[PDB]
Design an enzyme around this catalytic site. Sequence first.
Site, short mmCIF file in Angstrom:
data_model
loop_
_atom_site.label_atom_id
_atom_site.label_comp_id
_atom_site.label_asym_id
_atom_site.label_seq_id
_atom_site.Cartn_x
_atom_site.Cartn_y
_atom_site.Cartn_z
N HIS B 53 0.86 -1.17 0.00
CA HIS B 53 0.00 0.00 0.00
C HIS B 53 0.90 1.22 0.00
O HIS B 53 2.01 1.18 0.57
CB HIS B 53 -0.87 0.09 1.27
CG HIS B 53 -1.78 -1.06 1.49
ND1 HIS B 53 -1.39 -2.21 2.15
CD2 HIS B 53 -3.09 -1.22 1.17
CE1 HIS B 53 -2.41 -3.05 2.19
NE2 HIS B 53 -3.45 -2.47 1.62
N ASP B 56 2.19 1.84 3.44
CA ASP B 56 3.21 0.94 3.95
C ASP B 56 4.61 1.44 3.65
O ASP B 56 5.56 1.14 4.40
CB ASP B 56 3.09 -0.46 3.35
CG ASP B 56 1.76 -1.09 3.56
OD1 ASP B 56 1.19 -0.88 4.64
OD2 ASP B 56 1.36 -1.89 2.70
N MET B 87 2.60 -5.77 -7.96
CA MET B 87 1.28 -5.29 -7.63
C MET B 87 1.41 -4.22 -6.58
O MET B 87 2.29 -4.29 -5.73
CB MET B 87 0.36 -6.45 -7.17
CG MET B 87 -1.05 -5.99 -6.71
SD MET B 87 -1.16 -5.37 -5.00
CE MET B 87 -1.26 -6.94 -4.15
N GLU B 180 -10.61 -6.49 -5.04
CA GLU B 180 -10.44 -7.53 -4.02
C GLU B 180 -11.70 -7.54 -3.19
O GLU B 180 -11.91 -6.61 -2.40
CB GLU B 180 -9.21 -7.28 -3.13
CG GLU B 180 -8.95 -8.39 -2.13
CD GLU B 180 -7.87 -8.04 -1.19
OE1 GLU B 180 -6.98 -7.24 -1.58
OE2 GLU B 180 -7.81 -8.65 -0.10
N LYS B 182 -14.54 -8.56 -0.29
CA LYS B 182 -14.56 -9.00 1.11
C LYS B 182 -15.99 -8.84 1.60
O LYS B 182 -16.63 -7.83 1.27
CB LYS B 182 -13.59 -8.19 1.97
CG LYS B 182 -13.48 -8.84 3.37
CD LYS B 182 -12.46 -8.06 4.22
CE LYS B 182 -12.16 -8.88 5.50
NZ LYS B 182 -11.23 -8.04 6.40
N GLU B 216 -9.50 -13.46 -2.49
CA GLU B 216 -8.72 -13.92 -1.35
C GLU B 216 -9.36 -15.16 -0.76
O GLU B 216 -10.56 -15.17 -0.53
CB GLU B 216 -8.60 -12.85 -0.25
CG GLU B 216 -7.80 -13.36 0.92
CD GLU B 216 -7.61 -12.31 2.01
OE1 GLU B 216 -7.13 -11.25 1.66
OE2 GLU B 216 -7.97 -12.57 3.17
N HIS B 219 -11.54 -14.52 2.30
CA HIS B 219 -12.71 -13.66 2.17
C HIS B 219 -13.91 -14.44 1.65
O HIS B 219 -15.02 -14.31 2.20
CB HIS B 219 -12.39 -12.48 1.28
CG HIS B 219 -11.38 -11.57 1.90
ND1 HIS B 219 -10.88 -10.45 1.27
CD2 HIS B 219 -10.78 -11.62 3.13
CE1 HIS B 219 -10.03 -9.83 2.09
NE2 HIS B 219 -9.95 -10.51 3.22
N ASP B 244 -4.99 -13.71 -3.86
CA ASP B 244 -4.43 -13.62 -2.52
C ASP B 244 -4.62 -14.97 -1.82
O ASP B 244 -5.76 -15.42 -1.69
CB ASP B 244 -5.13 -12.56 -1.68
CG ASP B 244 -4.66 -11.16 -1.98
OD1 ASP B 244 -3.82 -10.91 -2.90
OD2 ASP B 244 -5.17 -10.34 -1.27
N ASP B 254 -11.77 -12.20 9.88
CA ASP B 254 -10.78 -12.44 8.81
C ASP B 254 -9.46 -12.86 9.45
O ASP B 254 -8.78 -12.04 10.04
CB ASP B 254 -10.67 -11.16 7.99
CG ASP B 254 -9.78 -11.28 6.76
OD1 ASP B 254 -9.62 -12.38 6.16
OD2 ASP B 254 -9.23 -10.21 6.44
N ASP B 256 -6.66 -14.49 8.13
CA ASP B 256 -5.42 -14.32 7.37
C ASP B 256 -4.30 -15.22 7.89
O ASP B 256 -3.19 -14.76 8.13
CB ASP B 256 -4.95 -12.86 7.43
CG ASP B 256 -5.76 -11.94 6.56
OD1 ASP B 256 -6.65 -12.39 5.81
OD2 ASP B 256 -5.51 -10.73 6.67
N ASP B 286 -1.50 -12.85 1.24
CA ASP B 286 -2.07 -11.76 2.04
C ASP B 286 -2.39 -12.43 3.36
O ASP B 286 -3.47 -13.00 3.54
CB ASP B 286 -3.32 -11.17 1.40
CG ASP B 286 -3.79 -9.95 2.11
OD1 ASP B 286 -3.15 -9.60 3.11
OD2 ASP B 286 -4.78 -9.31 1.71
MG LIG Z 1 -6.17 -9.42 0.63
MN LIG Z 2 -8.14 -11.24 4.68
#
Ligand SMILES: [Mg+2]
Ligand SMILES: [Mn+2]
Lengths: 386, 386, 386, 386
Positions: B53, B56, B87, B180, B182, B216, B219, B244, B254, B256, B286
């Site tokens: 991002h 980031d 990406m 993406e 979610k 993802e 998700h 992802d 979520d 992850d 991710d």
């Molecule tokens: Mg993601």
């Molecule tokens: Mn996630």
Amino acid sequence: NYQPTPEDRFTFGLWTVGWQGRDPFGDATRRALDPVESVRRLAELGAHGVTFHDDDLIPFGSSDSEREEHVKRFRQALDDTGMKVPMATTNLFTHPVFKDGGFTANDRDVRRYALRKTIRNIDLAVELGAETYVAWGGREGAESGGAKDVRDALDRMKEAFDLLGEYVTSQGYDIRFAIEPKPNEPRGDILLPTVGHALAFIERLERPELYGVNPEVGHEQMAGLNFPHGIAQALWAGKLFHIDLNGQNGIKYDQDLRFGAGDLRAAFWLVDLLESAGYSGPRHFDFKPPRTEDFDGVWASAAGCMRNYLILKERAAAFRADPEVQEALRASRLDELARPTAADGLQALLDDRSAFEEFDVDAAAARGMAFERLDQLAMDHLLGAR
Amino acid sequence: NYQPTPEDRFTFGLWTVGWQGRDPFGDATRRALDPVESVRRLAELGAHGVTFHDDDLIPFGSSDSEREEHVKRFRQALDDTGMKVPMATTNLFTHPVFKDGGFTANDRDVRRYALRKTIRNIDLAVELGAETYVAWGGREGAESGGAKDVRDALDRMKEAFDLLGEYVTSQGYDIRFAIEPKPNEPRGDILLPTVGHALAFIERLERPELYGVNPEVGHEQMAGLNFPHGIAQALWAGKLFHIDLNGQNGIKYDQDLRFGAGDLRAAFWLVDLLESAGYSGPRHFDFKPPRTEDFDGVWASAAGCMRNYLILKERAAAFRADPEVQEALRASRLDELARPTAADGLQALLDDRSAFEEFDVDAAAARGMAFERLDQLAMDHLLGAR
Amino acid sequence: NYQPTPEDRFTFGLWTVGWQGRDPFGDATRRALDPVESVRRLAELGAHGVTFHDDDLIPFGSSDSEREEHVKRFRQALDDTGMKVPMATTNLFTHPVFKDGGFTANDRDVRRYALRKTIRNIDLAVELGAETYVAWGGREGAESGGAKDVRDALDRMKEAFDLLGEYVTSQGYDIRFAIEPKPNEPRGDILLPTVGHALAFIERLERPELYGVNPEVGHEQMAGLNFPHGIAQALWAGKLFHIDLNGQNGIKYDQDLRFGAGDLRAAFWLVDLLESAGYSGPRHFDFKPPRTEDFDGVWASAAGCMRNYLILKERAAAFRADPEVQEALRASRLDELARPTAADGLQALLDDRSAFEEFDVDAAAARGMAFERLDQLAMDHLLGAR
Amino acid sequence: NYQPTPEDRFTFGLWTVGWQGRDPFGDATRRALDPVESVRRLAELGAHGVTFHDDDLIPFGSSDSEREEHVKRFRQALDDTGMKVPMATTNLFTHPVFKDGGFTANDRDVRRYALRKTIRNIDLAVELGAETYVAWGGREGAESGGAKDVRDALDRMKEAFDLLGEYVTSQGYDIRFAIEPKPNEPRGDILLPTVGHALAFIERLERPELYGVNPEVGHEQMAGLNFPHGIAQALWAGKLFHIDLNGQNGIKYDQDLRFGAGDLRAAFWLVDLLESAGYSGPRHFDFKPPRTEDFDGVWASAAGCMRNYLILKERAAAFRADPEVQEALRASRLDELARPTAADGLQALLDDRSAFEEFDVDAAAARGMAFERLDQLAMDHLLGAR
Ligand SMILES: [Mg+2]
Ligand SMILES: [Mn+2]
Ligand SMILES: [Mg+2]
Ligand SMILES: [Mg+2]
Ligand SMILES: [Mg+2]
Ligand SMILES: [Mn+2]
Ligand SMILES: [Mn+2]
Ligand SMILES: [Mn+2]
């Protein structure tokens, strides 16, 4: 008080009030209903019409002679009551030959049989005046990963809907198709599991304008999704051809409770949206009176579907007509949501220093949305506390 | 054994191995990572590249001078390691100004700010060589029904993606967008909640060919959906631009988790499909190393993502290469699923008495699918029991 | 209209109206509240009292001198407002040392630290007049299977609660404990995930009568469970010591919406049960005003919790007082449910031929339950349509 | 390779391999199996025994003469094969008279009939040598809130189990009861929905030591719960009398897939726990071969249940026997979890300054749990990658 009239466009499947109560763990608790009796009983409750699967009306395997007799009897009940038939559909799920699907069965001969069975009933639906032909691919899917190549299945699914669209246009029929999504049950996973997946699939069909969705309250809730949001996306795409109303208590088996039961606030926001958007299709109830009920409970449950719609319609109208609500909507900037972000265009936005270089991000961040006061106004209206 | 190489195209977000462990109930358990240190550590583990991002890489509010310094440092780490940046994406979710969304915030000035913030980072992504620009609308949605008119929000969402597509084409950039999805979290419901809803929305954009999906694992599993099925639909539509990979234990927050954790059999069928379909994009993780872990656990978790992919790739290849499996696939008629239902066309199908009039429905119904023997072959291959 | 008074026993955690809006993807949108300001603002809204974690009131790491000053300030606000402190609890979840639990951390020294931190706050709770000490084991659990031997963890959990019960009885304190179950979040799975698991665990403690449950609407709904049913089981066991009221939209992350939001019909049946059963504990709201809100939205949200309780209490009372409902309850044999099945005893039942040999199973099977007419009466009362 | 023997104690319900494939949307795809044929076919697959509902073995309504004939035929098959009958149960769910429950039906005469039907089959179970009598209250529950006062229902439920315990002890039978929880389906919500709720209820029965639980993999997963955790709590309480093994893909309808399907990693951690804890009861498979299958698929599916158990048992044993795993378990302090927190007692803990006053909270917080390296060792063992 809150009495339905045929102008309210409330419709019921034969299979709804006619569900005998057989579930995966139990035998029928009610005897079978004559479709003629259902038509007459629903017309006295204020319904506008009925829908049917082919096999609800004509017992499977009926000779062509028995078939005509079953239709003629049914037509006479429609004529005696004034009831319409706005929608029809095919049973591609009950008979064992459909155990791996109809349109996407791995066996090619079953797929062809599935198409011929559908086409026969399209002709009948058109004869009876139906505007919408629904397709619920309840057996299209899988319990295990290797059983179904999903890209091949999607090729087969597109092939079937394309052939049906060729049939309709070649016959000159004025009928459109509506895909009814369901995420699972009776298959472990069902293809085109949600409104969004069905909307996306339609855009790959040869004649996309013949196809829309018939979303069901309970089905999107079986994936935990917000049904009013999904309906809003269908409306936005111009694809809400029909809708199935019922109730569902979260993520579990498909309950098909009467409309208003299940998630009551979601029902309120659904009615608010359908009425605000001017939805003019049938308000169809795809529900099952619980198997605890006898026949009087069946008709009480069906009357309740309609009553709850009419109560919620009144509360949503009162909510939107309330000046204090209109003021709250402005306070939460719903009016700004409806305005273009950048009707001045890309170049203007790129040179607009107030959009970035001189944007006061902390002043913007500090403004409350006032969403909770708005939602409590919505709660008070729903409960008749103002 | 099972060692990744940069040819395996494994990539990681800065925000993944760099997640400090702050969750809704707890403070950070790990110190912040320098993006340069992450690049070097990931390159030694065999990764192919990193994603970011904007926030980031460049701390929010950085002057143009600090900005250039942060990029130059980062670029030098990419040059020293050979790591790519395939990406990039925008943080439109952390800062309080985005509390009601970026692209679909009710406040118009926040929407314009959101677009300018994105456009700035598209330029940077292109400078760094990114092929895909991801958009995760984490704040686009609502907790209550009146807070968001979803049709207006969809108008605003389309307006934003259309303007971004105008920007890209007017600059001559070779970059494509990937939405993406979610279903929820951090908003009560998020707009475009699943792969299907995103695929359907894309078809209403002015230049649909610039946009695909970045699904993802976790998700779609947060809605109880079959992730390999959803990926198959994205592939079928030609829209899987990026993916992802991670793990998720069913319908909850979520998680992850590292890839391979969560639903292991779904991971196997996902790898089988990506490799069979010849997916050639990045295998992006991710994920968040659990906040129980110190920095050695972080790198162990990241190595595990890659290892589990490579183990599953081996087991899926062995499964498909096995003659007994190839024989089982024929026994279950996967070969018939891949053949056209009616390449002879509509009229031939309508006059084919073997499709209906003389179809032996009971003989067809009696044929077993043999799916369970196939699935146990798949289980034995996954577990290395053959 | 519907104004709360301190006799309604409505209470709020400091951490509820004081939640700054930090979520896993976003920074705080609101500044921190002085606990004194919350006490004064809640007292003007009609609340009866407040609850606290130790770390809500005394910043973590405070010297003994700062500690006394924070308490003295707080006590003065209670004296100025008349607010009570009926319940207190320990923060064993925020600080990184608790990342693997407090009472069931794998590290023994963290477990001992966890017990000492709790005991310190029990003393303070008793000083402030709290009747109930809540324990929410938010970090007790795991993300992976090998990380936690659950039988050892249960041994450690029992050891901690037993030592706390020894401490309370040795000090002569008049305080009881209430375990607050949660199925997941922030751990992948949390120990004692539901009301039932907590009730079962209590029966293995050395002094079971000191311990009950503090169930939360949203937590049981995060497992898809019927919260009124779970509350009924807690009441039946005599173990409902306290209750946390809020709203939750199904199976997802812990939303902590204001009470009445989420599942509205479940809220109605909960209020009906609490009031019918004569629950006389605090009506505690464990909720978070959404991070979209500024401080006026915070107080609007808190007022809404109370208003919705009072509206539902009125509708439930009207429902139970309605003769037509009383008649419907008899029609559905709720009166028979309340009668003993076999007060005549086993031998009488074994020789009662009308219970088996001459029982007319088909006549019994044919009686409808009339549940749908009853539920529509319940719906009409909730909506004020009678 | 991986061949079951009767020493592995694998058992199957008659109703499992005998499920004809009737689901809520479809007719039977398979003919009924003679219980004698199932006994013989299961014995050749290596099963240790069978279980039955009364109505699986004796058709409902059978005269006393037909009854004896059905038992005698069955007994002869057990004698010819060596198969045992370790467990039996009552069908209180299929016949329409049970549409509102058996033990907690609102109609008192149905409750008495339910008890007499159970008692008749307890006698038969004891005749056939069953050690465990299972009770699955599939119809005990409700679809709407007013239909069932849950406290009265719990009184009735306790009354029924107490009378059954009086019957067993008065006859001198050596049989124990095991409650099989299920959160929903076929009722909207089922009473005693999870392992925890059943464990808590048992502690209120007159003779708690006669009653334990028979948890089912899929049922706890229908509430999103961690099945190995729930089993660990049952073991810890001493109440795991029996267990039902199968597979389930998350929160949806009750799939009853063969064991190993569904959540594979959960199956691994379950086997690890059962074998580590020395569970010595039957490994019972309560599963349904999918209705896509013919009879050869039925027996393939049943063989797969057993094979997957034996493969997972091997991988779990290898995991626990691995020195590197034993070293990792120490690194994650599983050994410390097993040690008492405060065997030195309360007063020692209160005066132990190293537990609080001089506890270094930041040094403790900095220690990583090393859980991810442990879990990847567990993953590598499961997949045979070491
Ligand atoms: Mg993601
Ligand atoms: Mn996630
Ligand atoms: Mg429907
Ligand atoms: Mg709480
Ligand atoms: Mg079972
Ligand atoms: Mn449905
Ligand atoms: Mn909560
Ligand atoms: Mn089951």
